[PDB]
């Protein structure tokens, strides 16, 4: 039970042969669950390798996304680190400070803004005064207000956070916006320029997007309908 699946299954071309034969095998665990229960027909014993000194995982939740991102920021997938810039792009290069603080170019921090643990700042993300950012990834070209807290949060590019906003364990997608006097709860998802009006606190289960039936609701300049 001590085996986290990395889904890096290296194969022989007999896998494609058995997938051509068995049309009912839809995905990987279907293939292994059909291969293990039928042994004297189509024998094909699957072998295994266990890694103890290197990292490997994938993402399928907000939980897997948050855990893998917290492992990337805490350098568990070294050499693949954001300050190394393995993708050669000038808009993604960072410098590694103490306590895993990654700082990009032209950030323009303000007075009183404290970064304590596991903070990444992209290209051109302006940060106001008296902020408190921890365990979080901030995208490039963002705008942060004043007297804010941001813990375990994932801000993507183009977002705009006003003053007094308190954001915990959430995810903000591209070009987002939030007004003042807002406080976010854990496991909140904001998706592709959803604006949240003032004096509107979201519950724990919160996914708001532009599509009505796929998300829980659709927001506007006012959060009430």
């Amino acid at each position: 039970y001590d085996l986290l699946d990395c889904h890096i299954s290296i194969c022989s071309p007999q896998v494609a042969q058995l997938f051509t034969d068995n049309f009912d095998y839809q995905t990987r665990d279907d293939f292994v669950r059909g291969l293990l229960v039928n042994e004297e027909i189509l024998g094909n014993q699957i072998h295994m390798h266990v890694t103890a000194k290197e990292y490997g995982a994938r993402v399928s939740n907000l939980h897997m996304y948050s855990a893998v991102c917290a492992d990337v920021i805490r350098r568990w997938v070294y050499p693949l680190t954001p300050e190394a810039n393995f993708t050669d792009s000038t808009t993604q290069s960072c410098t590694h400070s103490r306590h895993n603080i990654y700082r990009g170019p032209e950030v323009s921090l303000g007075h009183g803004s404290i970064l304590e643990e596991n903070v990444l700042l992209g290209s051109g993300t302006v940060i106001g005064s008296n902020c408190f950012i921890t365990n979080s990834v901030i995208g490039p070209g963002c705008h942060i207000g004043d007297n804010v807290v941001l813990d375990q949060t994932y801000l993507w590019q183009g977002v705009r956070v006003a003053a007094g906003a308190q954001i915990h364990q959430s995810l903000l997608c591209d070009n987002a916006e939030v007004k003042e006097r807002v406080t976010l709860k854990p496991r909140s998802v904001l998706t592709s320029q959803v604006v949240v009006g003032p004096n509107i606190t979201l519950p724990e289960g919160s996914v708001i997007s532009l599509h009505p039936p796929d998300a829980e609701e659709d927001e506007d300049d006012g959060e009430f309908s």
Binding site: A52, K53, R98, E117
Partner: protein, 357 residues
């Protein structure tokens, strides 16, 4: 009766007088299964000491006193003898067997001394089970006060010193320092703790657990990263295992080195020790009296390049794993005892208070 354990591996030329045993073999291969020479509780204590299951000094002394309670409860009086001489004549093979299992800590030595002073001070006018219940009551009252009340007093004296927004550095595994940090986190102080660990015990992970089950933000690193983290560290809190007559701190092996780097980074160190872990015995280095663990404990798993696997085939190869070392009294600032905040230069003087003089 009781033989001696064979010395394992090639000993260091500087550590030729100190014994170096192995954990894979034990002394009970040539002993009775109903233990006749040694008490069954004593051989259970020796087996749980030699295998490394009880390694903390307070836990070692507590399990030693529990085994002594089981010895006294299962003790009878022979004819033509007194209890005060037959008990000290019978406990010395038990302590010698415990020494042959593992070199004794200073808390165990002071517990042996206090038990000898207690069981020689009983009167002949008392009965058998009367004196047995008196000695059991003295033992658990003694361990009750000079563990729990001393730990509470040391934690109360440490609460008025730890500030808010502080950074505390700890090393190793100990009950007292983790209790201090737990009571300071629950009492109202907001701080983060940096844990320093060293090979091959990896016991600080234990107190790392004791920092995350209480909700304290923690940081785990090793003794090469202590030089990197000590510019950030404001205060260093350490758990002393033994305090010597010149103010020296006999403790786990990464403490005097850590105290020297902390003094080089202008960070004051704060050892935490009780009066029953003191010594009138004094030493100035880690060479005249020290514990030697197994030479087979230093090998590692870095792929499949174990270089120290067949180390005994090399005749000119020496392997050494030190347990305790000695800090000079020039490096340690605080000694937080239940009587207050004393320097190291006050360590024997409190002993003059603790000898009822």
């Amino acid at each position: 009766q009781v033989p001696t354990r064979k010395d394992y591996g090639s000993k260091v030329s500087l550590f030729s007088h100190l014994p170096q045993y192995s954990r894979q073999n034990s002394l009970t291969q040539f002993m009775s299964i109903p233990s006749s020479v040694i008490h069954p509780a004593m051989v259970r204590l020796g087996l749980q000491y030699s295998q490394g299951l009880v390694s903390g000094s307070n836990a070692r002394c507590i399990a030693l006193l529990r085994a002594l309670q089981q010895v006294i409860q299962d003790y009878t009086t022979p004819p033509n003898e007194e209890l005060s001489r037959d008990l000290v004549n019978k406990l010395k093979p038990y302590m010698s067997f415990l020494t042959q299992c593992r070199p004794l800590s200073a808390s165990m030595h002071n517990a042996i001394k206090f038990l000898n002073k207690e069981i020689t001070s009983v009167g002949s006018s008392k009965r058998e089970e009367e004196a047995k219940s008196e000695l059991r009551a003295a033992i658990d009252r003694y361990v009750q006060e000079k563990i729990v009340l001393a730990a509470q007093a040391i934690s109360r004296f440490a609460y008025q010193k730890i500030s808010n927004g502080d950074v505390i550095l700890v090393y190793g595994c100990s009950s007292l320092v983790s209790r201090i940090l737990q009571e300071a986190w629950t009492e109202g102080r907001r701080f983060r703790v940096v844990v320093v660990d060293s090979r091959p015990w990896l016991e600080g992970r234990h107190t790392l657990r004791s920092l995350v089950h209480a909700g304290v933000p923690a940081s785990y690193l090793l003794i090469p990263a202590a030089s990197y983290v000590l510019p950030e560290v404001s205060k260093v809190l350490l758990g002393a295992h033994a305090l010597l007559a010149n103010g020296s701190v006999m403790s786990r092996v990464g403490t005097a080195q850590l105290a020297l780097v902390a003094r080089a980074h202008n960070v004051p160190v704060l050892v935490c020790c009780e009066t029953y872990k003191f010594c009138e015995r004094v030493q100035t280095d880690a060479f005249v009296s020290n514990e030697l663990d197994d030479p087979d404990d230093l090998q590692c798993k870095r792929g499949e390049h174990v270089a120290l696997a067949n180390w005994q085939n090399h005749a000119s190869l020496r392997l050494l794993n030190l347990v305790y070392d000695v800090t000079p009294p020039e490096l340690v600032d605080l000694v937080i005892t239940e009587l207050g905040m004393i320097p190291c230069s006050s360590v024997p003087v409190v002993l003059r208070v603790k000898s009822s003089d």
